[PDB]
Design a binder for this molecule. Structure first.
Ligand SMILES: [Cl-]
Ligand SMILES: [Cl-]
Ligand SMILES: [Cl-]
Ligand SMILES: [Cl-]
Ligand SMILES: [Cl-]
Ligand SMILES: [Cl-]
Ligand code: NA
Ligand code: NA
Ligand code: NA
Ligand code: NA
Lengths: 297, 297, 297, 297
């Protein structure tokens, strides 16, 4: 209950890079400001979408501190501190605390198989280093390879210090079961392409990569379902998925960064290798989308 | 468009067996009448839920003809004629036509791997034998092992003679994509536990095993979303999933048949071997559920 | 121990069909005789390869009785009686007993999820109906969807009346574990393409679809490993897999039947729908293979 | 052909840690010397088994340089330089070159989905930074989540600068297909528990975590198959798998490090968090195994 201030719609921040694959600090600050001015409830920093796993610890800390400088006190700040290593995750959690974040988050540690008790002790250690700011468990089985049962999720979200679950799963039976077992839990829908259905199943917010370019649509789905405008929520999700279809074709992170570049938010839209640049044949569609989204506001 | 009369909420009929595992014809007729009096839009006969794959062809034909005798002209009748064999499926389709069914349906043929073109020719052959009544494609990847792409689904639902898709998939991104590509397609949600979310994603009806014991709840979800009562659709789905949780624990088909026996619909609640009987320790819960559901009406 | 007479190399018999998809009884008898004259240790009748799951019970019984008429007393006869239904499997087991088979076999029942105890009771019931001839458990997770643990396999192979395991799995760690736990168990390698490696891991024989066209190669691998001719076993497996590569491209069962037709064993090489016929562009390769195999003898 | 000096049996080196999870440099040097004195053909440094993915770049470089100091010129040295990031992998490849390694290796980049062309360009970039020492492609689908086709493997192993494939896959049909397509390719079996069968299928060596405690058994399997002693290769693999069964129960890396500690090779047997320590109840078995292995020499 006492972490209700974490509920809402938060973009998973992209990390802008310059032409030589170094962090573009000026464009990062502009992206934070852009998201604030979209009216989002918070920002989620250094997650999957932030290309955390092709960055060093010091690079991730640098991003966390910059975003806190632009955003502390204006919107909720959540730091994704997860690494495979518990000690590395603890370092990032202690940094997030120093910089004034409102919460930390960690993906279930991946690549190596760990027992469920090893997962729990990993979260417990990070929570200790977070030094009193709450933890968001981040579940993304498609990418982590970690396949938790409902009963395991129930144990994770009741660990002391856990205040939320980021549920990047398309299983909306499980989403409803989680909500029914935990009526006050902050529960973020993780797959943008099912946002409206995920809210209906029990999520009370979302963390999403595509919110960086069209957060007003997701805020509008929240409002429509609250108002009882079924058709409007469906038409908004329809338009979101037209965009997601295109992003999946071109490559999601780089497509988002390219749209943001055509919106004059990011100076350079590159991802880090091994992500390739966008193919030239997609540029016209991405620029047209940027133009469409700016007009729609 | 011209098959809009197929849209709606239809139970996947269970096949009642007697104490020696023979078809219980008297209880079958009472179950059909019970479902009609629940106000369903149709019945789906001889599907997975009907234990088709532990019955012979002649047993499946017997069930189809009995149900048509009780139900033709009162509610929509859909015959699931699918087998692995194309010739066996054709036999059941020709029988369904003789008995006056409104549509046929066939699961993607399973066990052996078949090419997509072999799947299409299988449907084409069944459609020919159906002799002018439309086909419902039935997609259930979890059980069939058949993993169709969106583009393959698009080709199946535009085959001449196909009038609907039974989508037993929890991927509600794909449900929305199907709806967006086919705005007039009759699109049945197949997993009862996500019915409200599946409707929101684009389904315009459902075929479900649990509708046999509580169809009014699913009809109520349809109505709530049409009316814009978000919270009511969520609370109905909540109550449905409390029931589905219990059915999954006890075994779904036999749990449904046991509830129906305690509602005085079926004389004997057995499934065919290798399904075991219900464990004694679950009987109290199942009888209490039957009592609850009868009172709720 | 007392079922050592079941060890060896046995083709999974194909079921020949005529031009109208009816059983071709004359070609079936010739195929049995052909396999006997290849020097095989037994024949496995009515399995996956036999297209059991696109045949009726009476058709499967017809095949079992014909093969017993040609082969009883000359080679070991194993009847695959498995269906999803326990009662149907029992009918085929009782028939196999009447016809004088040496063993029965049943695939783990599929499509519907069953508990492990339901699987065990299914085998127990079939064993009872087999009336004293031993059971071969048939494990094929890729097609059945049934994913048994080692401990579950250990319980199945120690059920009273079980005399063998047909292991159609590419996990040769598990093959070795099974052999180490059951030093006397008759253990059939099920994937022809790893036969030599499967024997080395602990199998003491095999049941295979491609043995119908080149059993002498698999018999030769057995002999080579017994003699300590590592290189000869590898070169034989090499040549087998060149053939399997081609069969996978053209479709395995129909490619085998086509090679047999070009060897003058089968009059008509068709599979039942939904299997398509062989594409014309593959006929030259298949006829050349038949010519090669006949010359190699 | 010109990289035949890479063929053979090489332990995947463990990285010893001290009691505070820092690298134990003295125990690392002793472990290298221990493996040299087992008569191995090479050592594979900084791989999965080396706990690379819970170490920083500078820690991985430190390990590479230490091992080269102990081992350059005495045995083949292969540096696993793979990270998700191409630029990080390039840094480690350039370091491996500086330190005098004989080859580099990189796991297919994981977590994020990459196209096959992105994978190829990743290897090309690392090969460039390796500055003339050959690349070992490392395939481990169970952990990487990367599911390459045979045709994709064929393209990777023919990239300029690729001299070997580390095949951590249990699919021995594919192992044979790779060998048949590439008769001169250096092909390492990656799953120790199927080593004998993998050699028979076409591998000409292996890279393995359990070689750190019993390399003579794997060298003995190579010799037995070369000599035509089928039974001896089977009995050696039998004994290896008894050990692997135990290591899987206790946790493989920490069990290996514990056995090595009881052999007086490593001062401290800890893995890095989130790996837990060994449970006390397993210590007796692990110490008995160490005693057994020392006596067997
Ligand atoms: Cl990182
Ligand atoms: Cl990582
Ligand atoms: Cl049937
Ligand atoms: Cl079936
Ligand atoms: Cl059958
Ligand atoms: Cl690293
Ligand atoms: Na907020
Ligand atoms: Na109707
Ligand atoms: Na025999
Ligand atoms: Na060497």
């Amino acid at each position: 209950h006492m972490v209700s201030h974490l509920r809402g719609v938060m973009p998973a921040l992209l990390t802008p890079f310059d032409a030589q694959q170094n962090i573009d600090r000026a464009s990062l600050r502009r992206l934070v400001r852009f998201n604030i001015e979209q009216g989002v409830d918070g920002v989620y920093v250094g997650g999957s979408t932030g290309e955390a796993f092709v960055q060093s610890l010091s690079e991730r800390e640098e991003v966390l501190e910059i975003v806190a400088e632009e955003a502390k006190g204006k919107i909720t700040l959540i730091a994704h501190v997860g690494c495979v290593s518990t000690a590395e995750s603890q370092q990032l959690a202690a940094a997030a605390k120093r910089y004034g974040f409102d919460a930390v988050s960690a993906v279930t540690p991946f690549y190596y198989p760990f027992s469920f008790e090893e997962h729990c002790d990993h979260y417990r250690a990070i929570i200790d280093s977070a030094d009193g700011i709450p933890m968001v468990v981040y579940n993304i089985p498609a990418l982590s390879g970690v396949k938790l049962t409902l009963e395991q999720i129930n144990q994770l979200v009741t660990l002391p210090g856990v205040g939320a679950l980021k549920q990047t799963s398309g299983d909306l039976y499980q989403m409803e079961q989680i909500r029914r077992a935990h009526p006050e839990l902050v529960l973020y829908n993780g797959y943008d392409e099912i946002f409206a259905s995920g809210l209906l199943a029990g999520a009370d917010g979302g963390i999403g990569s595509t919110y960086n370019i069209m957060a007003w649509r997701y805020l509008g789905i929240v409002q429509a379902l609250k108002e009882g405008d079924t058709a409007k929520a469906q038409q908004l999700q329809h338009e979101c998925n037209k965009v997601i279809d295109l992003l999946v074709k071109v490559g999601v992170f780089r497509g988002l960064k390219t749209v943001l570049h055509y919106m004059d938010v990011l100076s350079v839209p590159l991802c880090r290798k091994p992500f390739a640049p966008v193919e030239d044949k997609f540029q016209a569609e991405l620029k047209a989308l940027a133009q469409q989204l700016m007009q729609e506001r």
